[PDB]
């Protein structure tokens, strides 16, 4: 009696699901064929709490002897630039305050789409993946220096 009762709710739940994964499947092949883009992710410069917020991957120079370049996820928040060490573990500061910063388009590096952030306490090298990501990251910082 428990079996057949439960079996009636059990079948209906998986009939409900069988539709469910068909909708996800149906949208995912619409997404894949028609709107699926190859350009790199681009951050969003939108106001947040504390002033301008933007977040995304950048290349930077490491403590390898050649100064070997390397990819990390960076956030601009509360007039500050931090970088992430691993996700959910706490971030590290890049510039104490961006509003005492300058942002250098750096035409003498040969490094594709490189910039340098020179602030009162601290300097840091950076690199964007694209000239679009160079001009938006340099502009997000330059607007942040103007905050």
């Amino acid at each position: 009696q428990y079996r057949k009762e439960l079996g009636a709710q059990l079948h209906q739940l998986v009939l409900n699901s069988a539709r469910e994964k068909r909708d996800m499947e149906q949208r995912h092949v619409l997404l894949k064929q028609k709107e699926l883009g190859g350009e790199e992710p681009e951050p969003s410069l939108r106001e947040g709490p504390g002033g301008l917020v933007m977040e995304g991957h950048l290349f930077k120079r490491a403590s390898n002897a050649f100064k070997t370049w390397s990819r990390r996820w960076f956030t601009i928040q509360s007039n500050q630039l931090v970088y992430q060490k691993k996700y959910k573990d706490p971030v590290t500061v890049v510039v104490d305050d961006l509003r005492l910063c300058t942002v250098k388009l750096c035409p003498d590096s040969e490094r594709r789409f490189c910039f340098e952030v020179v602030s009162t306490s601290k300097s840091c090298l950076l690199q964007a993946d694209s000239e679009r990501l160079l001009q938006l990251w340099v502009s997000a910082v330059q607007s942040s220096i103007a905050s």
Binding site: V14, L36, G38, E40, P41, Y87, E110, Q127, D129
Partner: protein, 214 residues
């Protein structure tokens, strides 16, 4: 499973997304390993069960025949015949419960491990081939100087391929994970349900004749 994979960030490709793709896989593998342990224990019950009913049926012929050869009594001559069919009829119900048990092991559990992770793995395989491809596509794009234009263009054409087809792949992988989350409960619940149906059916066969046998 479903909420150990951020579907939300699969076009975005954050460290969040990368943490999730590594975290979700261990519960699929755990699960696969537990599914195999039930498919083997199930056949373990099918072999001892069947050996037990071969021993049981053979014993039932011999207990009756030994009594039939026993000294003459007319109530024993009919009663043992009532007994003989009862003894075998209860067994036939129990042979049927092994075969029902066997069919559900094929429909649910053996099917789940054989078929249900194939498409997730086919997506997972190509998705880490594209992730690996993407990581070097970006490496070779970052590490070419500005004056080496031609090498940079070759690496960025590969990246546009990698980033698109990696986005393509993250959706499938999100889909087949979302499928197994739902599927996993329903098949094991169906399997304990179809099992005890055959039990209720096997025990009713021995109860349907309980009155005549009494």
């Amino acid at each position: 499973m479903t909420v150990k994979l951020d579907f939300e960030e699969c076009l975005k490709d954050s460290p969040r997304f990368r943490a999730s793709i590594e975290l979700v896989e261990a519960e699929v593998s755990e699960l696969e390993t537990r599914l195999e342990k039930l498919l083997k224990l199930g056949t373990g019950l099918l072999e001892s069960g069947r050996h037990y009913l071969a021993a049981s049926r053979a014993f039932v012929v011999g207990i009756c025949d030994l009594a039939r050869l026993g000294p003459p009594e007319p109530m024993m001559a009919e009663c043992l015949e009532k007994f003989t069919v009862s003894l075998n009829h209860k067994l036939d119900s129990h042979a049927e419960l092994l075969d029902a048990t066997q069919h559900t092991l094929q429909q649910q559990i053996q099917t789940l491990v054989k078929e249900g992770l194939r498409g997730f793995r086919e997506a997972r395989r190509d998705f880490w081939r594209g992730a690996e491809s993407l990581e070097a596509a970006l490496t070779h794009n970052a590490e070419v100087p500005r004056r080496r234009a031609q090498e940079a263009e070759e690496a960025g054409a590969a990246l546009r391929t990698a980033r698109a087809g990696y986005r393509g792949r993250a959706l499938d992988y999100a889909l087949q994970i979302n499928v197994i989350e739902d599927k996993r409960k329903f098949d094991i619940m169906e399997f304990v349900l179809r099992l005890v149906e055959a039990q209720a059916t096997h025990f009713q066969q021995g109860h349907e004749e309980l009155s005549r046998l009494s």
